[PDB]
Amino acid sequence: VKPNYALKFTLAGHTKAVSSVKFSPNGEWLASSSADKLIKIWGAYDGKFEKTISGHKLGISDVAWSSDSNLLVSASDDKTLKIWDVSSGKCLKTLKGHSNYVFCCNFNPQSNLIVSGSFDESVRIWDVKTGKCLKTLPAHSDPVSAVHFNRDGSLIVSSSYDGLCRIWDTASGQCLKTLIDDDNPPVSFVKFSPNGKYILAATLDNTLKLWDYSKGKCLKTYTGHKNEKYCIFANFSVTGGKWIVSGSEDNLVYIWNLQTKEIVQKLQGHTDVVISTACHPTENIIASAALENDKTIKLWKSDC
Amino acid sequence: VKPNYALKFTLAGHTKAVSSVKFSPNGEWLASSSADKLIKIWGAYDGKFEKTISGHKLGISDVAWSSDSNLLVSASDDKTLKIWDVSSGKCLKTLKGHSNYVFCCNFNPQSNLIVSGSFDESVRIWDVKTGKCLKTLPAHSDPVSAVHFNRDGSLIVSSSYDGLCRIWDTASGQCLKTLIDNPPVSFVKFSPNGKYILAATLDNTLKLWDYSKGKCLKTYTGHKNEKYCIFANFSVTGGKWIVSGSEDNLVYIWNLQTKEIVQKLQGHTDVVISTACHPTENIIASAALENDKTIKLWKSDC
Numbered sequence: 371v372k373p374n375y376a377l378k379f380t381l382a383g384h385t386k387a388v389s390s391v392k393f394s395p396n397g398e399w400l401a402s403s404s405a406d407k408l409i410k411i412w413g414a415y416d417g418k419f420e421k422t423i424s425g426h427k428l429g430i431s432d433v434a435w436s437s438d439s440n441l442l443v444s445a446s447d448d449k450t451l452k453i454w455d456v457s458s459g460k461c462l463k464t465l466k467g468h469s470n471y472v473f474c475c476n477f478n479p480q481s482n483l484i485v486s487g488s489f490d491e492s493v494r495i496w497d498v499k500t501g502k503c504l505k506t507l508p509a510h511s512d513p514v515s516a517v518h519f520n521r522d523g524s525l526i527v528s529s530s531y532d533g534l535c536r537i538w539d540t541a542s543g544q545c546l547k548t549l550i551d552d553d554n555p556p557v558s559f560v561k562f563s564p565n566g567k568y569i570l571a572a573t574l575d576n577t578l579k580l581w582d583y584s585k586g587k588c589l590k591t592y593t594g595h596k597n598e599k600y601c602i603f604a605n606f607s608v609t610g611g612k613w614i615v616s617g618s619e620d621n622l623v624y625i626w627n628l629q630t631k632e633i634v635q636k637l638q639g640h641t642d643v644v645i646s647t648a649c650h651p652t653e654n655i656i657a658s659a660a661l662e663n664d665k666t667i668k669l670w671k672s673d674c
Numbered sequence: 675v676k677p678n679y680a681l682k683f684t685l686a687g688h689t690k691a692v693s694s695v696k697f698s699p700n701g702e703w704l705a706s707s708s709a710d711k712l713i714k715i716w717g718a719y720d721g722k723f724e725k726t727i728s729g730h731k732l733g734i735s736d737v738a739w740s741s742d743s744n745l746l747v748s749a750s751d752d753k754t755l756k757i758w759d760v761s762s763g764k765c766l767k768t769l770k771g772h773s774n775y776v777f778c779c780n781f782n783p784q785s786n787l788i789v790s791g792s793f794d795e796s797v798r799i800w801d802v803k804t805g806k807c808l809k810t811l812p813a814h815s816d817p818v819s820a821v822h823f824n825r826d827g828s829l830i831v832s833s834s835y836d837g838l839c840r841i842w843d844t845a846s847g848q849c850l851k852t853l854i855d856n857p858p859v860s861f862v863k864f865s866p867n868g869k870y871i872l873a874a875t876l877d878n879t880l881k882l883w884d885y886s887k888g889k890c891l892k893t894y895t896g897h898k899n900e901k902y903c904i905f906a907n908f909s910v911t912g913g914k915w916i917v918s919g920s921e922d923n924l925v926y927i928w929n930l931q932t933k934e935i936v937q938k939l940q941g942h943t944d945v946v947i948s949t950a951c952h953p954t955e956n957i958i959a960s961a962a963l964e965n966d967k968t969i970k971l972w973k974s975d976c
């Protein structure tokens with residue numbers, strides 16, 4: 371069994387490299403962010419452009435949705451995050467405190483907190499309602515590439531170019547676990563697995579690894595794509611077959627069998643690095659986005 | 675201070691009346707049961723359907739979570755209770771012994787015991803590990819409408835259409851107290867601090883009792899409850915509220931101390947038979963009978 375993702379729509383509009391794509395939790399929308407300082411909202415099923423959201427003063431590296439799909443948070447090189455009302459496009463709050471580019475962000479499942487990571491090497495936890503910074507974690511000794519909450523919000527995982535992944539207790543701010551090897555290439559992405567027991571980490575040795583972080587054991591590796599430079603998102607695809615999905619610096623989307631690690635599909639069409647992919651929450655749909663020779667988002671659909 | 679619960683999601687999927695909704699202790703999930711013989715699991719923050727759990731041969735009246743959120747127990751008209759692994763959906767044990775419909779169930783905080791009540795007028799205490807019945811208590815003289823453990827599991831409270839609430843010692847099975855006009859008692863549970871019980875009677879009244887002193891400290895009224903066993907709850911995450919469904923299709927919310935109705939949630943199109951309060955967020959789940967068949971999730975700032 372292999373998926374058969376086929377191209378359905380190409381979405382143009384951004385005027386610099388795209389940086390992130392995310393489907394809303396209710397399945398209805400895709401949000402994209404770009405170095406052009408904009409967020410764009412698109413229909414998830416037909417690619418229809420819905421709106422542009424503007425106000426950051428420099429490029430945007432990441433965007434994340436609240437669980438009720440009503441809010442977005444964005445992380446910008448202007449050293450802020452912004453919380454947006456998706457329906458109106460209005461900026462509700464500007465989150466100030468990082469001292470350099472904000473690279474990654476996420477809401478907790480409860481969506482009362484936002485976590486952010488920055489080039490300033492810190493991880494910050496923010497109150498959604500007030501916009502205030504609740505905690506600053508001295509998390510890493512180099513830029514922070516990803517931050518993600520687990521399924522009950524009680525943990526955060528962070529990754530950094532310092533080579534580490536760390537697990538944090540949300541409520542206390544304490545580091546519960548550091549994952550480190552004899553060799554520690556930059557970690558360019560991390561997230562919790564669907565069941566919360568694993569983390570999937572990308573390193574710039576062209577490799578994805580699935581770790582049991584409690585036991586400190588690497589269960590699976592996914593290779594054959596190209597990733598030595600950019601922070602490229604990876605995903606778990608849960609709607610049909612159990613796949614790992616990632617972009618790649620050879621302009622393809624790679625899809626692997628979770629268990630066997632075999633590459634099961636490569637999606638061809640983009641004309642630059644595929645910096646970001648997202649998997650739809652209920653349908654077998656992938657969104658992919660590329661850097662500045664391309665500047666487009668593609669929507670792909672599969673039977674499994 | 676008054677809450678401002680607003681509708682966030684409507685969860686459709688059951689094909690007959692919903693009978694109970696419960697949040698998992700870790701806050702991640704809502705479990706629902708229905709007369710359609712199914713349990714459904716839903717995401718607590720995005721309302722997304724997760725899975726259906728099936729195997730009972732007749733409708734289900736109640737479902738309850740273990741304290742690690744890994745197991746469910748369900749009580750059915752098929753006269754059995756089933757213990758389920760939530761991750762796999764598999765039935766681990768079928769608890770056999772009641773001679774009629776099983777109406778209510780709960781784990782203790784340690785989650786090594788389950789308590790059940792039945793139309794057979796008994797309360798049973800079951801070993802989770804083996805599924806064996808440990809004790810049968812001749813608890814009531816009419817159907818048992820609710821059973822609940824206190825904060826550490828040392829006590830059980832039961833209620834019945836016979837008009838009584840009874841407090842039982844878990845370890846010994848002995849009745850420590852009987853609270854005795856005697857309208858049918860359609861629901862009971864211990865308060866968060868274990869010192870009170872909140873009891874619903876089919877005279878449209880919720881009462882908060884100090885059961886050790888035999889004193890009724892508060893009543894909550896203004897809703898409609900003369901027929902169904904409607905759950906009620908203590909809301910501990912924001913303001914101190916009592917929450918209940920109602921036979922006029924609304925969710926009622928009262929101030930614990932003043933007994934004032936502070937909000938009524940409108941949206942359901944049938945009796946709101948069950949409500950649940952999320953363990954850490956100000957989120958209510960409500961569920962309704964068969965003209966409606968949906969669960970609604972509501973969110974408040976306090």
Ligand SMILES: CS(=O)(=O)c1nc(NS(=O)(=O)c2cc(Br)cc(Cl)c2O)cn1C1CCCC1
Binds near residue numbers: 567606611612614628
């Ligand atoms: C193969 S397996 O199906 O047995 C399995 N499930 C998990 N859990 S996971 O990574 O969180 C997860 C990933 C996806 Br993609 C989808 C879902 Cl639903 C999901 O739960 C891991 N594995 C195996 C690989 C490593 C241990 C055995």
Ligand SMILES: CS(=O)(=O)c1nc(NS(=O)(=O)c2cc(Br)cc(Cl)c2O)cn1C1CCCC1
Binds near residue numbers: 882892908909913916
């Ligand atoms: C008003 S009060 O705050 O003084 C108060 N607390 C309790 N304890 S309770 O019922 O277990 C309880 C209920 C809720 Br709802 C939430 C929490 Cl957290 C909680 O602990 C009772 N009362 C008063 C009602 C009658 C006696 C005085």
